[PDB]
Amino acid sequence: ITGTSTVGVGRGVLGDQKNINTTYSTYYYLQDNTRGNGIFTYDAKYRTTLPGSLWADADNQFFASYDAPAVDAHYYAGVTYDYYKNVHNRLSYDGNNAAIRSSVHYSQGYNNAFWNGSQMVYGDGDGQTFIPLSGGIDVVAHELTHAVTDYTAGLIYQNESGAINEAISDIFGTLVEFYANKNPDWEIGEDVYTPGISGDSLRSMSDPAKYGDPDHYSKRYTGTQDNGGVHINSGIINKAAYLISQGGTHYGVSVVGIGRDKLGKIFYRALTQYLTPTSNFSQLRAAAVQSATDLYGSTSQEVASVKQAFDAVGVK
Ligand SMILES: CC(C)C[C@H](NC(=O)CNP(=O)(O)[C@@H](Cc1ccccc1)NC(=O)OCc1ccccc1)C(=O)O
Ligand SMILES: [Ca+2]
Ligand SMILES: [Ca+2]
Ligand SMILES: [Ca+2]
Ligand SMILES: [Ca+2]
Ligand SMILES: [Zn+2]
């Protein structure tokens, strides 16, 4: 909408107060004009018709329980925009400052979030498996990263290319969580998963097998559920990325860690310059090796560590 840029204040899903960029024109709207061509947050009103209505508020204060998922979807989209711009010199998901759209209060008891080809969408959860999913910065960044992937490598959402698509979203979801630097970890979804159980998460990148996911190519899922295991076999790539950053010895293979920033540079370059829609795990290894070669040189520790990490997870 046309209006003037304003700054509201509210509380997110976990009860934390934050400022949010809004736009005033009769109402205060969840429209942040400070980033690209805007970040826009919508109310889906428990329905499945998208996007719903651009979020409108009478007083620019967002402290109602109903407001909390919108506050966080809006704010964390801004953090993720900042990560891509400041760290990778990428302007929004298309590289040309496309407007970023999110809807919250999607459906009833909806235990998930997604990128539908055009926008981000967040359920409220059923209060047992999840609380509103925009409360997790790694979830929000997972979603915006799907948009980045779709606009760049275009990884098809099945089998190995789809597991790479998933892992890329978990990797950059985690790197954004570290960028914001509030309780960062290598776990996925911990801030919104199972409010009645402490210390768990939906996936682990450091130990995928903790939640049943493979940590070696020899344990990959080969069936048809989950689009050929895209949320399962992502564990193999997530583990490789964790090892590149943090190091470790895994199935007897030692990896010298190179840190999160270099992991992010290598995988961002692989995603945007080398991967294609049908890339498989072996092709991801080659893309990561080449990306590290471009950035650090063929004889570098960074290249050697990429090779060690893929060796450790059985990907040649
Ligand atoms: C369009 C969709 C209806 C279909 C499909 N997306 C999905 O299936 C899930 N959306 P998502 O991948 O963005 C991630 C969001 C997320 C939630 C919590 C923590 C972190 C991220 N959900 C996710 O990881 O859940 C686990 C799981 C889902 C399905 C089967 C098995 C496990 C699509 O993107 O095409
Ligand atoms: Ca209000
Ligand atoms: Ca965390
Ligand atoms: Ca996390
Ligand atoms: Ca929990
Ligand atoms: Zn995903």
Go through the domains of the chain in sequence order and give each one's CATH number.
4-151 (3.10.170.10), 159-313 (1.10.390.10)
Q: Which two tokens stand for residue 227?
A: 């689009």
Query: Between helices 159-180 and 281-296, what is the axis angle to 10°?
Result: 40
> Cα(22) to centroid of ligand 2, in Å?
12
Give the length of the chain. Answer: 316
Provide the 8-state DSSP code for 94. T
Nearest to 215 by CA among 197, 194, 239, 195: 239
Determine if residue 187 is labeled as part of a ligand binding site. yes
Resolution of this deposited model, Å: 1.3
Could you tell me where the beta strands, DSSP code E, fall in the chain?
4-11, 17-25, 27-29, 31-32, 39-43, 53-54, 56-57, 61-62, 100-106, 113-115, 120-123, 187-188, 203-204, 248-250, 253-255
Kind of pairing between the strands at 39-43 and 100-106: parallel
**Which experimental approach was used here?**
X-ray
- CA distances (Å), origin 262, targets 27, 82, 235, 292: 44, 18, 20, 9
- Say if strands 100-106 and 120-123 run parallel, antiparallel, or are unpaired: parallel
Which residues are registered as beta bridge partners of 72? none
- Measured from the alpha carbon of residue 8, the closest ligand is 2
**Residue 149 is encoded by which pair of tokens?**
């992937």
Residues 6+ apart with CB under 8 A from 90: 84, 148, 268, 272
Helix (H, G, I), strand (E, B), or coil: what is residue 116?
Answer: coil
Neighbours of ion ligand 3 (CB under 5 A): 183, 185
| DSSP structural state of residue 108 | S
Query: What are the start-end ranges of the H helices in 130-257?
Result: 137-151, 159-180, 225-229, 234-246
Is the minimum distance from the CB of 211 to ligand 1 under 6 angstroms?
no
Q: Is 112 in the pocket of ligand 1 (CB under 6 A)?
A: yes
Q: What's the CA gap between 206 and 21, in Å, rounded?
A: 35
Omega of the bond leading into 195 within 30 degrees of 0 (cis): no
Residue for token pair 């900042």: 82
Q: Residue 115 C-alpha to ligand 1 middle, in angstroms?
A: 9
The Å distance, Cα 312 to ligand 2 centre, comes to 52
Does residue 231 carry a catalytic annotation?
yes
47 vs 107: CA distance, rounded Å: 5
